[PDB]
From a paper:
As a type II transmembrane protein, comprising 274 amino acid residues, TMEM106B localizes to late endosomes and lysosomes. TMEM106B consists of an N-terminal cytosolic domain, a transmembrane helix, and a glycosylated C-terminal luminal domain (LD) that can be shed upon cleavage by lysosomal proteases. Here, we show that TMEM106B, a lysosomal transmembrane protein, can serve as an alternative receptor for SARS-CoV-2 entry into angiotensin-converting enzyme 2 (ACE2)-negative cells. Using X-ray crystallography, cryogenic electron microscopy (cryo-EM), and hydrogen-deuterium exchange mass spectrometry (HDX-MS), we show that the luminal domain (LD) of TMEM106B engages the receptor-binding motif of SARS-CoV-2 spike.
To enable biochemical and structural studies, we produced the luminal portion of human TMEM106B (residues 118–274, designated TMEM106BLD) by overexpression in human cells. The protein crystallized following partial deglycosylation by endoglycosidase H, and the structure was refined to 2.6 Å resolution. The final model spanning TMEM106B residues 118–261 revealed a compact fibronectin type III (Fn3) domain, an ubiquitous 7-bladed β sandwich fold, closely related to immunoglobulin domains. In TMEM106B, the domain is crowned by a short α helix (α1, residues 208–216), which is inserted into a loop between the canonical Fn3 β strands 5 and 6 and stabilized by a disulfide bond between Cys214 and Cys253. Endoglycosidase H cleaves N-linked glycans within the chitobiose core, leaving N-acetyl-D-glucosamine (NAG) attached to the protein. Concordantly, four NAG residues were found in the structure, linked to TMEM106B Asn residues 145, 151, 164, and 256. The N-terminal portion of the protein, not present in the crystallized construct, comprises a cytoplasmic tail (residues 1–96) and a single-pass transmembrane region (residues 97–117). To further confirm that the spike-TMEM106B interaction is required for SARS-CoV-2 infection, we used our structural data to identify six putative spike-binding residues in TMEM106B, mutated each residue to alanine, and tested whether these TMEM106B mutants still supported SARS-CoV-2 infection. Substitutions M210A and F213A had the most pronounced effect on virus infectivity.
Numbering used by the authors: 115 to 261
The structure:
Amino acid sequence: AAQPRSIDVKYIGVKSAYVSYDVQKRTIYLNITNTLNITNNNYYSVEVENITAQVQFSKTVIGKARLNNITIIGPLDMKQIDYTVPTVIAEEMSYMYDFCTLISIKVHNIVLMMQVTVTTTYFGHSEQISQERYQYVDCGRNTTYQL
Ligand SMILES: *[C@@H]1O[C@H](CO)[C@@H](O)[C@H](O)[C@H]1NC(C)=O
Ligand SMILES: *[C@@H]1O[C@H](CO)[C@@H](O)[C@H](O)[C@H]1NC(C)=O
Ligand SMILES: *[C@@H]1O[C@H](CO)[C@@H](O)[C@H](O)[C@H]1NC(C)=O
Ligand SMILES: *[C@@H]1O[C@H](CO)[C@@H](O)[C@H](O)[C@H]1NC(C)=O
């Protein structure tokens, strides 16, 4: 059991996603709630200084969120962390309005690029853990979640 074992960050997926459309500005409003698994396999507490995440589409950042003072994670513990990222697809990518409001197809799946960076500090050292994962989202309807 050799320490310091680095924090373990697993990107789960999209728990919920609510969509709104503005006809006149030809924009999609896309609120994505992501779930994050953070595991501490050390026998000492470690604190998660902050989390910064950004939603990307067509190689273009469409949304961003910042979380501060997440929580202290005790020894051998893990925390499930949900964070919501409001995103907007408009202007240069306004063609997505037509596709996402397309009637001839019943489901409208697009691929978003999720980026997240978790900064943890232990014993006066700051470690940084980042991930990039591609994630499916349905931009043609809400994706809800009810326990
Ligand atoms: C999506 O997020 C924006 C900004 O946070 C908010 O104004 C809007 O009401 C949200 N829509 C839904 C359906 O939650
Ligand atoms: C994330 O953590 C929860 C809580 O322990 C667990 O049930 C779930 O399987 C984890 N997700 C993955 C993809 O392992
Ligand atoms: C996150 O926390 C670190 C350490 O406290 C700080 O230096 C940094 O400015 C914060 N924000 C980002 C985006 O790293
Ligand atoms: C579900 O999507 C529709 C699309 O027009 C939107 O009007 C509605 O607000 C969404 N649901 C919620 C709870 O926001």
